[PDB]
Amino acid sequence: PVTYSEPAFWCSIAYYELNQRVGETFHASQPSLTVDGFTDPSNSERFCLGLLSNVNRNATVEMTRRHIGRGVRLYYIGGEVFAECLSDSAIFVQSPNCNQRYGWHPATVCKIPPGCNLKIFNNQEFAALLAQSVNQGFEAVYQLTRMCTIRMSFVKGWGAEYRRQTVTSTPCWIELHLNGPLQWLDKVLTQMGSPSVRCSSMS
Amino acid sequence: PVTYSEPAFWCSIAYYELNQRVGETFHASQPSLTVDGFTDPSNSERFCLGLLSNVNRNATVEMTRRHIGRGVRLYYIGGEVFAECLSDSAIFVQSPNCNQRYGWHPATVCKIPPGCNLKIFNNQEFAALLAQSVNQGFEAVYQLTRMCTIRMSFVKGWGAEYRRQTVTSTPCWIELHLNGPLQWLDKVLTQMGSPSVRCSSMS
Amino acid sequence: PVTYSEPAFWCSIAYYELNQRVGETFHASQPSLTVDGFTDPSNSERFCLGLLSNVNRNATVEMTRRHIGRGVRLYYIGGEVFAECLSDSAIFVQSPNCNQRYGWHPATVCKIPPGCNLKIFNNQEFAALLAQSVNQGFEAVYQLTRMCTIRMSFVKGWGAEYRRQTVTSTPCWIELHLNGPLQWLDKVLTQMGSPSVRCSSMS
């Protein structure tokens, strides 16, 4: 059985405008980085969304992109990940790991006002969930990828209360993948066998 | 005239869900790799499709992704490339190079049941076809890029017999590009001149 | 305040077919490169569009791709960038920096016939515009990203005179980003504060 090597990048970030992916995926090699609305294309610690083009872009998205500003600072201390709102506008985070910690609904979206920060991920909690997931079968273990994913919207909120009901309805959002947790999940997933119900070649 | 340097990656692989590209392109630097449905984001020998997100994903695709499992092993011995079905579900391959070898229709899709393998490419055959393609003109030489491309679907078949008629109708498939052959083709294409029928700036 | 490091790549190039992005972004590390319709996947000085696949491609695009040929040579001398038409078919360039230099409309598209070249960018002019942009506010400075972007179509023209009115209506085009200018803009943008009109979390 297989070999693992420590991820060179602790996370990857994908930017979206509504339901469309925009720009290349950003890979973070440093423990602290900022996703902002500016234009430096060569800072390994900055994912600058302002330089990303989209000929198909609409006015609402353009308008919102102008308010990203300093955006969000993403960093980790030990086994915990945080998101700090550097922007003059708030950011909205949907983190299953965070939501479960507070007993909130899994799809809960938490508002992080300017100047505030939130613990979007805790490894201990994830490791514990992963450990108990085995007794649930391939089914539950496979779905844990969602716990390694965190989505955040700049300026516009979505979900309960807000008119916008889904992340794809927001003008500017990012999707963060925590690579360490994903590798941890892989070590378990590869030993959980295959699904129960049969998937034919024709249906 | 120009200089060539040996490709650092023998192939590139693009993943798709129906007619939409999902995730970044994978580049293989090792002679053997596996494309599976798991989640390690840091193994140079594994293209793990399970960690790839798609907020726009439908139930059929999600369902099928759960059955990719160990997926397919792609490797080359000398000038020959093979695909082995490690998955508990079959994979379906459409390789023009393979199809021609057996006299099958160019768009033929070959089923590779679990545990089986198929020679999806042979360089000698390609080189020979390329050599005779010159007498066919820019036309035939330009179309040889198709010979350097191989498409494979996980779990679901397509083409003759199956309901699904095109690769874009399958939930999860990959597109492999053989870089050595592409460079070989380039050396010829750059010397084949331009098309015959005129392409205006207005039509 | 922040640190900048010289860009390892002087520019990035994105290829499109109509309104759809095709292929990975190309990053240039050498002062001279060519974007052609051929197939070498391993030359750091060549962005070969001919090897790029698109299962969703239409006949018009396929037809045009066959006429890209030697394509366009993009290179810089000092602080000036040029585009040379190596292709047997013309290329059409939309460069705000070039257009302003000649007093043409910002969206003007300039035809570069085979064998001809055009100065698509001049840093002195941009730096001067950037300097005066400050007195215009965040508004005008933010829009300068457009000056760092240049779009070019192969074979087919668009805009005034031609039937095609937008770049997204052309079969094969590229989008060039000048990284040095973008970093220069960043140094100013980060000091221009935030927008005037308020952007709420609900609208």
Buried-state track A53-72, b at ≥16 Cβ within 10 A, e below 16: bbeebeeebebbbbbbbbbb
Q: Among C22, C30, C40, which would you mutate to test the B interface (most chain B Cβ atoms within 10 Å of its Cβ)?
A: C40
Is C41–B195 a contact, with Cβ atoms under 8 angstroms apart?
Answer: no
Query: SS3 string of chain B?
Result: CCCCCCCCCCEEEEEEECCEECCCCEEECCCEEEEECCCCCCCCCEEEHHHCCCCCCCHHHHHHHCCCCCCEEEEEECCEEEEEECCCCCEEEECHHHHHHCCCCCCCCEEECCCCEEEEEEHHHHHHHHHHHHHHCHHHHHHHHHHHEEEEEECCCCCCCCCCCCHHHCCCEEEEEEHHHHHHHHHHHCCCCCCCCCCCCCC
Q: Which of A47, A114, A106, A108 is nearest to A74 (CA)?
A: A47
Q: Which of A17, A102, C110, C41 is nearest to B189 (CA)?
A: C41
Subunits close to C (at least 3 CB pairs below 8 A): A, B
d(CA B69, CA A186) in angstroms, rounded, equals 11
Breaks in chain A (C–N > 2.5 Å) following residue: none
d(CA C18, CA C173) in angstroms, rounded, equals 8
In the block, residue with structure tokens 């006429």? C67
Cβ neighbours of residue A128 closer than 8 Å, sequence gap 6 or more: none
* B116 Cβ under 8 Å from any chain A Cβ: no
Cβ neighbours of residue A197 closer than 8 Å, sequence gap 6 or more: none
* A56 Cβ under 8 Å from any chain C Cβ: yes
d(CA A69, CA A54) in angstroms, rounded, equals 18
What angle do helix axes C123-133 and C179-189 make, rounded to 10 degrees? 10
* C62 Cβ under 8 Å from any chain B Cβ: no
User: Letter for the amino acid at C129?
Assistant: L
Sign of the C-alpha dihedral computed for residues A105, A107, A108 and A112 taken in this order: positive
Token pair for B187: 């050396």
Using DSSP, state whether A69 is helix, strand or coil: coil
* B38 Cβ under 8 Å from any chain C Cβ: no
Is C90–B201 a contact, with Cβ atoms under 8 angstroms apart?
Answer: yes
Using DSSP, state whether A23 is helix, strand or coil: coil
Is B186–C38 a contact, with Cβ atoms under 8 angstroms apart?
Answer: yes
Q: Which of A39, A40, A76, A72 is nearest to A172 (CA)?
A: A72
Beta strands B20-21; B26-28: pairing state: unpaired
CA distance B81 to chain A (A): 23
d(CA A123, CA C103) in angstroms, rounded, equals 58
Q: Which of A149, A147, A167, A144 is nearest to A157 (CA)?
A: A167
Token pair for C71: 């394509």
A146 within 8 A of A84, measured Cβ to Cβ: no
Subunits close to B (at least 3 CB pairs below 8 A): A, C
Is B202–C67 a contact, with Cβ atoms under 8 angstroms apart?
Answer: no
* B167 Cβ under 8 Å from any chain C Cβ: yes
Using DSSP, state whether C127 is helix, strand or coil: helix
Is B42–A194 a contact, with Cβ atoms under 8 angstroms apart?
Answer: no
CA angle C59, B185, B121 (to 5 degrees): 95
CA distance C59 to chain A (A): 22
What angle do helix axes A179-189 and A123-133 make, rounded to 10 degrees? 10
Buried-state track B117-141, b at ≥16 Cβ within 10 A, e below 16: ebebbbbebbeeebeebeeeebeeb
From chain B, the residues in CB contact with A194 under 8 A are 67, 69, 88
In the block, residue with structure tokens 């969703």? C56
From chain B, the residues in CB contact with A191 under 8 A are none
Is B40–A199 a contact, with Cβ atoms under 8 angstroms apart?
Answer: no
What are the structural domain ranges in chain A? 1-202
Which architecture does CATH list for B1-202? Sandwich (2.60)
- Long-range contacts of C131-136, Cβ-Cβ distance < 8 Å, separation of 24 or more: C133/C188, C134/C188, C134/C192
Q: Among C194, C196, C200, which would you mutate to test the A interface (most chain A Cβ atoms within 10 Å of its Cβ)?
A: C194
